[PDB]
Every structure is written in C-alpha cells, then in structure tokens.
Design a binder for this molecule. Structure first.
Ligand SMILES: N=C1CCCN1Cc1[nH]c(=O)[nH]c(=O)c1Cl
Ligand SMILES: N=C1CCCN1Cc1[nH]c(=O)[nH]c(=O)c1Cl
Lengths: 438, 438
C-alpha cells in the first residue's frame, strides 16, 4: 500500500495511476485518512493533468464499489432506466421524467446529487418538500420501485459514498469541470442502479460552455459506459437560457408539477418528451423517437405521471395528506404548501425592446450568492423569448431571504436580460442531437 | 472580496493573481474559511502552474504580514543575521551556527520549521530536549536575544501563522518542491526577523535533486529577497550523502554538541565555518571568507558557542540544571539525558568493499516511515566515505521504537550503502559555491 502524498505526486507529474493506486486513494477517501487538503490536492492534480480512459473506467468502478451494487428481480431487468444531466440552469427535467417514465411501465431508481458548481441539484430541489428524505437504503429502494415505479435518492454510506465525498469537495475547489471526474461521478451512480439503458443530457452554451468540450464529454460518457456493460446514449442540448420559467428549489418543484398537469412552458415539456422518448427507444419500449415522445407526452396529459410522483413522494416520507394536497392542489395551493422566500422583489425593463434571451450564467451566479440551503430562494422569469416589452414592465421576480438586492447583484441580474430591436417572434424550441455507442 | 473557488480557478487556468487576490486567500487561510480541501487545491494549482516574481514577492509580503513584524533596539541593526537551509538529510548546521554566531557578537532570531518532505526540521530536533519550547512571543524573543544572543522558534499565532498552516499542508500534498512556495515560506520568516543579512544554504543531489533547479531557487531567493530590502546570498552545496554521522532529532542535538566541543565529523564542521564565515562577511563583520570561517571555528574550539547554546536552552525553558548537564556532560552523559529509542538494531555489510557513499534519500524515506513525532528514532552512520570494510562489519545503527526492521525496510536501507572496488582514500569535504545579489 502507498501513502497519499506518493500517489498525488504520481498524478501531479503527468503520470498514470494503476488500479491499486486508484482504489487505495478512493478507499482512503472513504475511511477518513485522505485529509481534506490531500483530497483537494489530488482533485486539482487530476483536473489539470487529466486521466485517460483506462483510468477513468477504474475510477468509476472504484466509486461504484465503495458501496453496494443494487439488485432487482429478474422480471424488471429490461424496464430499469435512468436519465442523468451534466447540468443546466432551471433544468427540472428529472423531477418530471422519473415519474412520467414509471407511468410508462419503467422502473427508475435515480441516484442523483446536490448543487454542483452553479447548477442546482435535484436532491436540493426535492428537499424543499417537507418530509422528503433523500437517504434511502437498497432494501427501501426496492419498496419504492414497487409502490411508485421510481425514486430519487442521494449518495450515502451504502451507495457510492466516495462519490458523495469527492462531489462535495469538487464543488468548492474548482475541480467540477473535469471530464474524468464527471464521467466517473455520473457513470458510478448509474452503474450501481443495474440499468438496461441510460441517457445523459449534455448541455452547452452549462459545465462546458464550448460545443467542442461537450461532444468530448458525450463520447466519453458513452464510450466508458459501453466498456462497463452499460448501454448509454447522450443528447447534446444548447442551454444558454434557463429551461422554463423557474430557477430554485421550491419554484422548480412547482413548475415540474405544472408540467405534470399537462401545462407548463413548451421548452420544458419538449425536452421531457424528447429525452424520455429517446430513453424508451434505447430501452426497446418504443420503436421510434416520435412514438416514444408521444408515450411520455400522454403520461403528462392523462394525470398518470402526476400519480406516480405522489406515490414517490409518500413512499420517500412526505406525509400522504401533504402529497395529495400538492399533486391535486392548484398552482396557488402549491405555492402556500411549499417554502416561499421571506420577501419577493421584481426587476424592471430599463427600456423598450424585444427579448432575445435571458442569460443563464449571470442568473445562476447571483442566486448562488443569495442561496448561500435556502429552499424558497430562486427566480421567476416573467417574460418569454420573442416578446416585445415596454420600459418599466417586470421581467424577473426574485424570491430572496436576505435584504433588498444590492446595487451590484441587481446590475448583475440586469445584464442577464438581452433586448434587441428585432420585430417580435415566437420562441423557438431548444436544440437536441443524439450520440450513440460506436 | 472574491470567494475561494473563484480565485483557485484564476490560478488553475494559468492566470496571474493580483495583490488583493493573494491577500484574500492568505487571510482566509488565517481565519479558517479556506477549508482544508481548498488549501490543498490552491497549493496544487500553484505547484503546477507556477507564480512569477511579482506574485511570489506579494505572497511573501502577505505571509510575513499575517503576523507581527519584529523590531529591535537600533544598536543591534547591523548585528542581526540568520542562516536558513532549503533542506538536507542530517543537516544540523543551524543548531550549531545560531549559538556560534551569537558568540561572535551577532544576534540571531531564527524562525525555523518542522519536518517538511523527507528533510527533518530544526524545531523537531530541539524538541527532543525536555522542556524546550519553540513557541515564543516577540517580547520573549527580545529577552532571548539579550540573554543568549540567539533563539530558535517556530511559527505561531503571532509570527507568520499563515506560513505555518500552508507549510503543514504542503508537507502532505506534494506541494513542497514549489519554487514560489519555498521562496515565500523562507523569505517571509526572514523578513519578520528584521535582519541586516541572510544566507540560505541551497542543497542538491535535497528538495531539488537537479543542479539546474537548485540554481534557479538560489537566484529566486536572492532576487526576491533583494527587491524586498533584504541583503541575501545563497550557497549551493551538493548533499547526496548525509551531513555528519547522524540523522534524527536527539541524535543530531548530540552531534551538534560534539561540534560545539570542537570535535565531531569534519564535514559538519566545514559547512558550519563556511556558511557562518560567508554570513559574517556579508554582514560586514569579517573582511574575507577565511577570516570569517576562522572566527566561527574559534568559537567552536574555545567553548563559547557551547556557552551561548546553554543560555539559549535555559532561556527557552530547558531546566537550567539540565542545560548545564547537557553542555558540560560527556557524549555518554548526553545520550542518557536525551530521548533514546526503545531498541537499537545494527545493519551489516553484505560483502567486502570500499565505502563510496551512503545515499541520503533511501535513508530519509525509511526513517520517515519509522519516525511516523518520535524523538529518539534515527540512524547512526558507523562508517566513513573512503573506508575499506570487510563483510559483516556494522555500518548503520538504527534507533527505532517499533519492531525489528521488516524484510523490505531493511533492503531499502541496504541500498543506501554503495561499495566500490576502489582502493581506500580520505573522505573529501563537501562542495560549496556562493551566489550574490546581482
Ligand atoms: N445534473 C447535475 C446537477 C448538479 C451536477 N450535475 C451534473 C453532474 N452530476 C453528477 O452526479 N456528477 C457530476 O460530476 C456532475 Cl457534473
Ligand atoms: N530547512 C528545512 C527543514 C525542513 C524544510 N526546510 C527548507 C524549507 N524551509 C521553510 O521554512 N520553508 C520551506 O518551504 C522549505 Cl523547503
């Protein structure tokens, strides 16, 4: 066995770590021996010197094996699927898609995570629901799949514990945007789920603003996935604007419910059907993308996705009365049942103009500031792309716990808003492009 | 004010940190805000992406200013000197030189450190002496300079606290061998000493095995030093073998006393006179190197260096009776008054041969293992360079607290010993070469 400083050095000098090296490190992360500073140091060493595919693969196997591998009754094998995102602002697609897919006859044991970087995390969003518990054991997860068809749980002592520790550390040390670290973090989770098919939404324009990097991530997820016996596909989607109208935790549960009522914004609905469709096709439950997309759409419209979501909530510890009130309530009734912020503040158009877009990144940065978790904090987009607005009309409603937005943070959000002199137009739908295993 | 993850990113991408950036980080190290993982991450980011001289300079000013700047009566100005080493195995030159120089009329407030990398630290060595306390306040240090002419103290809440925290973190994260981190760690300490002259022993063959890197370090210490108003010079010395006959904590106090009795091995004595000589010349208390070297030699021979060392010990909390017994005792009496190891084990020559050298690095690695602090653990070289030894004759005596050396650690020490078929010869003296401010 080598000590940590020796193995850090091996990577710091451009060297390739063996399998016992990788496992030694990971196992030290798990037991407490790798002190915080050594974890920060190795993460930065990997971030800057990289890993090649053999190494990423082993990293993935090692995080996967720090906890239990999950097992299901043979009868579920071909129905087990999942959808993971590499992250986008306002992306609440997972909240909708896990129950929608359960209502199409899939079983979905989603292991997901918390806020990472400036993208928000599904786990933090679900936690805005009083009594929703993300820590769920393997036995308990089998009961969740029985009752609801799906669940959304975090990493823990028994599931990928090492990815939870490395994940929390990356968040604060600028080692989030590492291809091998992302690949091993996503794939490790999905490997322990014992899936027949996985689709991963890779966004750009997002953790890798550049189209070139996103493609490399996509083929790395897919290639590394395929070598570990996982049928993976990736979608590349340009998200320079937030998905839908909401960014937050409670606000995004609210809008995901709107989507599950068969309403909500068209871009959120479009990506839910596109991505679930793709997944149904890949898993062999739909013959084509359009057939798949329509199966998922029908679940959003007939109330059945919503019904699976209510089962999921109650099964993960939400009081049953409260789950019913949430799924059956009106938009207004849902806003009173879920965290609100202490106060709300609207921001006003500076001049006449046509909304070209709201920029995702300035918005996420400011809300991470105000979010620093507070589950009612967030923002609400009051205008659409293509809309012509006049001077003075509200365009953002920020839900905040602290004081009136400062001069700075106000200017910073105001830069998010991009107006042209272009004639009004209808808001186009988001971009998608699949990537398969070669 | 920027948050830590932002400033880590700036350096991770090859970017140059401003002065407010550097100070922000350092001040966060000091207050607890920079978590262990962020410190590990920035250290590795600096280690791999480097800093240029403006940045190193500011880093140095910032670590220096995390605590108090030390002040002395105007009358001492031109007598204040110090000697720092970038590290070598068995290098106990500082223990001898601080009191020897005090006995030549200098005042020496040495701020030194602990084990870093695989080189041992002066502070750890002095601590083998019962009741020797390295934490000493600025007011207390003025009393030490009055009574003894010298002291040896560590970093603390009031002196370069930030270098103490970064120093401990580098030790475990393979960010020791960073030019800018070494420069700022050494220079920061020496800046707060308010010196008229400083000499820094740069070893190679040591933190930078390669001659090329050592030279770059030397001109960086000297150049960065000179721009901050410090008269610095560096000596380059090839230390591929241990200095003298001892490696440890208690063993090196013992040999430094032997040197102060005017005995001891010729290489230790040579480097003490060479380096102190240089320092006296640079500070203007000697006209030439040889005059300086002879002034220091005379202090080793007339018992006066020893007398200053006893004042220093008692003044830093060693019981006065115990200080007298140590300085006045015989070698044997000193070995009973200081930590011994639980057991001793000799290692035997495998075959006939002439000692070409004992290799420093294998020895340091093995003793860091067995040292993992235990202040009686160490090794003793029983043979000299040039000596012809027969099969079976003892060449190393390892003082250890644990069990009989394992098969491995035994082989690893045995590789340290390098025998030739060369006819016997007299052991040459170590290599030295000065470097001045340009
Ligand atoms: N979709 C989201 C929400 C926050 C982070 N993220 C992508 C992701 N997920 C991981 O599990 N691991 C990662 O490294 C990354 Cl990156
Ligand atoms: N002479 C010794 C004993 C252990 C470390 N060292 C050199 C040194 N000293 C510092 O103060 N800071 C460093 O970075 C370095 Cl490197």
């Amino acid at each position: 066995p080598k000590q940590l400083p020796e193995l850090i050095r091996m990577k710091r000098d451009g060297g390739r770590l063996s399998e016992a090296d990788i496992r030694g490190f990971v196992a030290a992360v798990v037991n407490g021996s790798a002190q915080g500073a050594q974890i920060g140091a190795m993460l930065m060493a990997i971030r800057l010197r990289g890993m090649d595919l053999e190494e990423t693969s082993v990293l993935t196997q090692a995080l996967a094996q720090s906890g239990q591998q999950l097992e299901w009754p043979e009868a579920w094998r071909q129905q087990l699927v999942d959808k993971h995102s590499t992250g986008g602002v306002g992306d609440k697609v997972s909240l909708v898609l896990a129950p929608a897919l359960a209502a199409c006859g899939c079983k979905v044991p989603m292991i997901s995570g918390r806020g990472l970087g400036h993208t928000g995390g599904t786990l933090d969003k679900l936690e805005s629901i009083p009594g929703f518990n993300v820590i769920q054991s393997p036995e308990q997860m089998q009961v969740l799949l029985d009752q609801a068809g799906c669940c959304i749980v975090g990493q823990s002592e028994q599931l990928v514990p090492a990815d939870g520790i490395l994940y929390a550390a990356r968040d604060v040390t600028a080692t989030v945007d590492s291809l091998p670290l992302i690949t091993a973090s996503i794939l490790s989770k999905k490997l322990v789920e014992g899936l027949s098919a996985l689709v991963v939404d890779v966004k750009f324009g997002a953790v890798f603003p550049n189209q070139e990097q996103a493609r490399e991530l996509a083929k790395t997820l897919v290639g590394v996935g395929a070598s570990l016996g996982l049928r993976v596909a990736a979608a590349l989607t340009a998200m320079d604007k937030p998905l839908g109208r909401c960014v937050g935790h409670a606000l995004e549960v609210e809008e995901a419910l709107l989507c599950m009522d068969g309403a909500g914004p068209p871009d959120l609905r479009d990506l839910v059907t596109t991505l679930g469709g793709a997944l149904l096709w890949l898993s062999g439950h739909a013959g084509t993308q359009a057939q798949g997309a329509a199966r998922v759409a029908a679940a959003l419209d007939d109330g059945s996705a919503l019904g699976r979501f209510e089962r999921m909530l109650a099964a993960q510890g939400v009081d049953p009365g409260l789950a019913r009130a949430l799924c059956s309530g009106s938009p207004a009734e849902r806003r009173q049942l879920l965290p609100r912020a202490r106060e709300q503040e609207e921001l006003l158009a500076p001049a006449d103009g046509t909304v070209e877009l709201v920029r995702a990144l300035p918005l996420a940065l400011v809300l991470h500031e105000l979010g620093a978790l507070r589950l009612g904090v967030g923002a609400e987009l009051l205008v659409d792309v293509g809309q012509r607005l006049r001077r003075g009309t509200p365009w953002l409603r920020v839900h905040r716990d602290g004081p009136a937005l400062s001069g700075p943070q106000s200017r910073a959000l105001q830069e998010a808003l991009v107006l042209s002199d272009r004639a009004p137009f209808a808001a186009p739908l988001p971009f998608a492009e699949l990537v398969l295993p070669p």
